[PDB]
């Protein structure tokens with residue numbers, strides 16, 4: 001499963017954060033800072049895969065804000081990238097032309113979508129339309 | 143522009159629709175097409191080439207292009223795939239040996255990007271003997287439930303009896319036409 | 323800016 | 333199954349059902365829902381491959397039952413996209429971790445070698461990880477990639493360089509140890525500050 005998934009901007013600002021492992025607040029902040037420094041201090045030809053702390057620290061950002069994932073060394077590396085791409089596509093479909101500004105304003109919506117998509121670091125919705133329909137139904141409830 | 147003529151034509155019925163006739167040899171595809179066009183069980187020679195016919199039902203002329211299941215005529219179905227909106231697969235539930243060949247032919251026909259807008263049309267042909275399977279065993283064997291992005295429905299139709307052809311035609315019309 | 327740009331550009 | 337091995341026998345009876353489900357999923361190569369980049373249900377396929385690799389890892393009946401499915405997936409899957417490459421890597425890992433046939437092992441080795449020559453950093457990292465995992469298993473077949481392992485040490489990727497160094501360390505035997513000693517010393521002398529201690 002994914003130990004922690006956090007969306008950090010190019011400048012270092014974090015737009016998202018979701019850790020599936022219970023860690024201390026100071027320890028979690030230190031881990032996030034180290035991950036940001038590693039991503040911020042990595043080139044574009046590093047394969048987007050980092051083995052930091054025995055965790056598949058996969059960084060792959062399609063825009064100025066980057067995304068990072070931490071999974072155990074028990075599954076394929078391409079699976080994490082595929083899951084990240086599927087989540088990005090689902091978020092773009094739910095929002096519509098998702099940008100950095102919309103992510104900050106839609107932090108609660110993004111957190112709800114992430115919770116409804118992956119829970120506990122594992123994949124919960126394989127389909128892309130069922131999750132979107134469920135999110136829309138939950139939003140329409142009020 | 144004005145669409146008064148189009149509205150007038152649609153008021154009394156203007157939609158026609160299309161259909162395809164494909165499947166293994168001796169699977170009742172020619173018999174099914176004859177029943178759809180004429181309505182009788184007429185014995186005919188094997189379709190070396192192809193059979194072209196049209197059936198008018200529900201104010202829609204669903205033309206069906208019958209294609210033989212012969213080895214020399216199996217690869218000729220790609221010629222009719224151009225400008226084709228429907229595709230009907232003829233299954234042979236009484237031919238266990240030819241069931242695999244029919245399934246492979248259906249998979250090859252459905253594995254083409256050109257034939258993507260045509261929904262699956264599987265007819266349980268040879269529904270006159272006890273050896274014929276049900277509407278779920280044939281679909282499970284052919285794997286029609288796993289064909290995503292395709293409207294495939296399993297219908298049992300007997301050429302000798304003619305029952306089930308109306309249900310298949312209605313399903314094809316619903317798949318093609320989605321109006322009131 | 324660079325923030326208003328689409329994440330995937332779709 | 334991973335938590336305790338008591339349910340492995342109980343969970344191993346569903347191997348034919350899982351094989352049938354995987355075959356049915358592979359039969360439909362398109363997916364309106366969950367089908368991305370031409371791969372339908374990539375998450376389901378990955379889960380099935382992981383279950384097959386973890387199911388019957390030390391049994392012949394389980395490997396034999398899923399041998400046909402693994403062979404079909406190894407040849408009926410296109411690795412042009414990332415999902416296909418991930419599926420192929422998962423199938424190769426499952427074949428290596430299970431008691432598969434000689435042909436399956438040869439196909440997995442060929443796939444790993446082909447992915448090693450890929451210019452993609454992620455593909456190279458995946459190939460290096462697969463080679464490192466398949467170090468003890470198919471060790472003789474892994475010796476054909478000695479040149480690739482040596483070249484990966486000089487690669488401009490930190491992850492790729494680390495994977496190449498790990499593969500070289502795990503591939504050291506009682507006959508290539510003397511020959512590989514000079515290469516290891518050269519790598520340690522001209523290695524990064526974070527890899528000099530690890531190399532030593």
Ligand SMILES: Nc1nc2c(ncn2[C@@H]2O[C@H](COP(=O)(O)OP(=O)(O)OP(=O)(O)O)[C@@H](O)[C@H]2O)c(=O)[nH]1
Nearest residue numbers: 167168169170171172173188189210211268270302
């Ligand atoms: N007698 C009989 N034949 C049936 C029945 N159901 C399906 N068939 C088959 O339908 C076939 C009719 O032959 P055709 O008119 O040429 O149509 P086809 O099955 O597509 O054969 P080809 O045109 O050569 O591809 C017969 O050969 C039978 O094998 C049935 O209920 N009774």
Ligand SMILES: [Mg+2]
Nearest residue numbers: 171172189208
């Ligand atoms: Mg005929």
